[PDB]
Amino acid sequence: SLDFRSADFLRTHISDTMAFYHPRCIDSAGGFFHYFRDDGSIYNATHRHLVSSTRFVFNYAMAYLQFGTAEYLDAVHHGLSYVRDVHRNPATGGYAWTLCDDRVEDDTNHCYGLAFVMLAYSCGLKVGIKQAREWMDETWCLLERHFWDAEYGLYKDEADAQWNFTRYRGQNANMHMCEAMLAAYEASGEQRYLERALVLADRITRRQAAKADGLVWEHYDMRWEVDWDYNRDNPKHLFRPWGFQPGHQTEWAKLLLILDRYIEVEWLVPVARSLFDVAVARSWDAVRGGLCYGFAPDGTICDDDKYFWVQAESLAAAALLATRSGDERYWQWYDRLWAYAWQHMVDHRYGAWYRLLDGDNRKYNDEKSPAGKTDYHTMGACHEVLNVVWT
């Protein structure tokens, strides 16, 4: 009976998750704490990760835009200071990947990191920080100088502190960069950002997908040919897992439908539908509920864990596909994804979502939000659905 498609539900859910993190995530000494137990207690106060530092700026910016709460605007400023004063290396323009007690632990320059930095700065401009328009331009320049490969229409992934790149090429940083470029466009109105987002979408969801039977594989060589073996022996790596990730197929479907809002071009929706339909067919657990984490190129599930962000990205995609297409089967997907998530993944005692469950929907431990997780994916999905329903 709960109406998962109502603004009432979505706004309340976002506010429940904000109540988990706020104000306990704020470190008055600098930035945010990045490791939280189920009950909100901090289990590692000293280790910090660029992906959390940036995602928490998104959390609070999108919440301020929705609710107007002054404490949330203050937290956007606090979070951006940490990104600019502690992560950022003024000598190179790069950003520390991880810190331990404000000392740089890993200074590797990850494109994935810069996507999140671009997103945090775009959020800063959206909340009225006019200086963020320049920080966005500085980040664009840094990306063009080192990461962009015009010949392929895609960014390289990973360089050391002197900008020496590895040969690895990855869809995931490009996917988040498409997302960041859309945010940058929404914040600044600059056409270059929207157009770069479109180029990235075309190259990944059409050209690269063609090499893997119509779905987006994660890992590639330096010539952007598929690397079928990368991390086969470390398949649960956090950013570079092995196998097709249904969550990334649906996340792309969402990004293509956001592009379709701003760009008039025929190919976006049919590609979005192909990615979403195949991904959920292959990965939905019809017995226990929920989308599984990974499947191999033969279709066989290779990781049946149920992750928070997979469900979230998929319901956001389903809502966008439903509204654009008028196909009610997409709202049925939306409803079943939420029914699963509400029953198993959302913590009704403390708020926010569990990170993952095993295939039997059991908890592994009490580490709700380790470094990298801020419920940016779950609140972000709700903010996105709020763009297509009456509020």
Residues designated as active site: 248, 377
Q: At what angle do helices 171-188 and 132-146 cross, to 10 degrees?
A: 150
Q: Which stretch binds Cl ion (CB under 5 A): 27-35, 188-196, 298-306, 369-377?
A: 369-377
Instruction: Report the length, in residues, of the chain.
Output: 391
Single-letter residue type at 39: D
As given in the structure block, the two tokens for residue 105 are 């632990």
Interface with Cl ion by CB under 5 A: which range of 261-269, 334-342, 345-353, 376-384?
Answer: 376-384
Give 58 or 148: the residue with its C-beta nearer to Cl ion.
Answer: 58
What's the rounded Cα separation, in Å, for the pair 116 and 219?
Answer: 20
**Minimum distance from residue 370 beta carbon to Cl ion (Å):** 10
Smaller CB separation from Cl ion, 53 or 374: 374
Print the binding letters for residues 120-159 with Cl ion: x by CB under 5 A, - otherwise: ----------------------------------------
- With a CB cutoff of 8 Å and minimum separation 6, the contacts of 38 are 347, 350, 354, 366, 367, 368
373 part of the interface to Cl ion, by CB under 5 A: yes
In whole angstroms, how close is the CB of 308 to Cl ion at the nearest point? 7
With CB atoms as reference, the residue minimizing the distance to Cl ion is 376
Tell the smallest beta-carbon distance from residue 390 to Cl ion (Å). Answer: 27
Q: Tell whether residue 20 is a contact of Cl ion (CB under 5 A).
A: no
Biggest alpha carbon–alpha carbon distance for the chain = 57
Give dist(CA 15, CA 67) in Å, integer.
9
Task: Candidates 17-25, 215-223, 225-233, 365-373: pick the segment binding Cl ion (CB under 5 A).
Answer: 365-373
By the rule CB under 5 A, 377 interacts with Cl ion: yes
Tell me how far apart the alpha carbons of residues 204 and 201 are, in angstroms, rounded to a whole number.
Answer: 5
CB of 353 to Cl ion, least distance (A): 9
Does 34 participate in binding Cl ion (rule CB under 5 A)? no
| SS3 category, 35 | coil
* 45 contacts 380 by C-beta, under 8 angstroms: no
Per rule CB under 5 A, is residue 376 in the interface with Cl ion? yes
Cα–Cα distance for residue pair 297/244, rounded to 1 Å = 7
Of 24 and 288, the one with the shorter C-beta distance to Cl ion is 24
* Identity of the residue numbered 190: E
β-bridge partners, 356: 307
Q: Which residues bind Cl ion (CB under 5 A)?
A: 373-374, 376-377
